[PDB]
Write a protein that binds this DNA or RNA. Structure first.
Ligand code: MN
Ligand code: MN
Ligand code: NA
Ligand code: NA
Length: 326
DNA sequence: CGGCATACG
DNA sequence: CGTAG
DNA sequence: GCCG
């Protein structure tokens, strides 16, 4: 088992779902207390389990696996023995975890805002609605639309949304293309948001595109919320039987030179991208982001024409999107 | 021990 | 501060 | 919390 998530296929569905989940609860809780190091380790340990070819049935099968030390191993041990890990259950039950989860799930609220609100004694969504003068416009939108935003987005919704985005994009700039990215590109059948990546085959033609797309979507009555320039985090109005629902949509523009890097980054998973960037820097001495891959010795950027190019330039075996579910 | 990804709005 | 993967 |  290699040590970095970008070095191993991780399928969407796997053979250690209960174990990986429990570890992810501990990761999430560590994040709520500002412990990014502990979050990372619990996430990595969970991901290692997702990459295994069969179920872990005995403690000995953890020996030699990366990111499994005393703590993660004890969690698995307790799950294998008793079907439950007391630490995990204590977190699940806790007022702190439940409230931080509720608040951080709101669009416009991060850990720091959620934590301050927690310390002020706030606990429920209606507590936040009672004091709306404190809220940002983005948090107001997140709170107004919270119920719809909690409802899973289906693949039929995605196809509907892609058509409307394409229409606006085609008027904004003929020849521009729209690519589905994020969790849906990794093969998820549902999600809590939709992500699109827009470019144009002629380098430079994509300059100034996003405002033009946004204004057209706005004039179609489709935008319930937007911030307004290359990333737009919107709430769209999606048609439903005799009605509609609010849906989070992210629209991203990149020049065709950067498209493979943007595609890679926006396809995820989050852990996969962190691990890939960590690997690039620490193992290969190259600096990776969603715009490019930089050699800080030569002071040059790697020109990639495809995701395949990028994996090759990092010396990694290619993983299709459905094996990047770290 | 230090490091933990790296951006844009 | 929020957002993204 | 774990790794190198
Ligand atoms: Mn997404
Ligand atoms: Mn998104
Ligand atoms: Na949030
Ligand atoms: Na840019």
């Amino acid at each position: 088992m290699p040590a970095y998530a970008c070095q191993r296929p991780t399928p969407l569905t796997h053979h250690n779902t209960g174990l990986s989940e429990a570890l992810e609860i501990l990761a999430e809780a560590a994040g709520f207390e500002g412990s990014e190091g502990r979050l990372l380790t619990f996430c990595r340990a969970a991901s290692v389990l997702k990459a295994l070819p069969s179920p872990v049935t005995t403690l000995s099968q953890l020996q030699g696996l990366p990111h499994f030390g005393e703590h993660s191993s004890r969690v698995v041990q307790e799950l294998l023995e008793h079907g439950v890990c007391e630490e995990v259950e204590r977190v699940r039950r806790s007022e702190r975890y439940q409230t931080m989860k509720l608040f951080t799930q709101i669009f416009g609220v991060g850990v720091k805002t959620a934590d301050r609100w927690y310390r002020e004694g706030l606990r429920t969504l209606d507590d936040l609605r009672e004091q709306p003068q404190k809220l940002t416009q983005q948090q107001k939108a997140g709170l107004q639309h919270h119920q719809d935003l909690s409802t899973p987005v289906l693949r039929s919704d995605v196809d509907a949304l892609q058509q409307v985005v394409e229409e606006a994009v085609g008027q904004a700039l003929p020849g521009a293309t729209v690519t589905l990215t994020g969790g849906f590109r990794r093969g998820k059948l549902q999600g809590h948001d939709v992500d699109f990546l827009i470019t144009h085959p002629k380098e430079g033609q994509e300059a100034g595109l996003l405002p033009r797309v946004m204004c057209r979507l706005q004039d179609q009555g489709l935008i319930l919320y937007h911030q307004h320039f290359e990333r737009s985090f919107c709430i769209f109005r999606l048609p439903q039987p005799g009605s509609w629902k609010a849906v989070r949509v992210d629209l991203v523009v990149a020049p065709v030179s950067q498209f493979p890097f943007a595609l890679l980054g926006w396809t995820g998973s989050k852990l996969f991208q962190r691990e890939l960037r960590r690997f690039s820097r620490k193992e290969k001495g190259l600096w990776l982001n969603s715009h490019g891959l930089f050699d800080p010795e030569q002071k040059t950027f790697f020109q990639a024409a495809s995701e395949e190019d990028i994996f090759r330039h990092l010396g990694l075996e290619y993983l299709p999107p459905e094996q990047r579910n770290a």
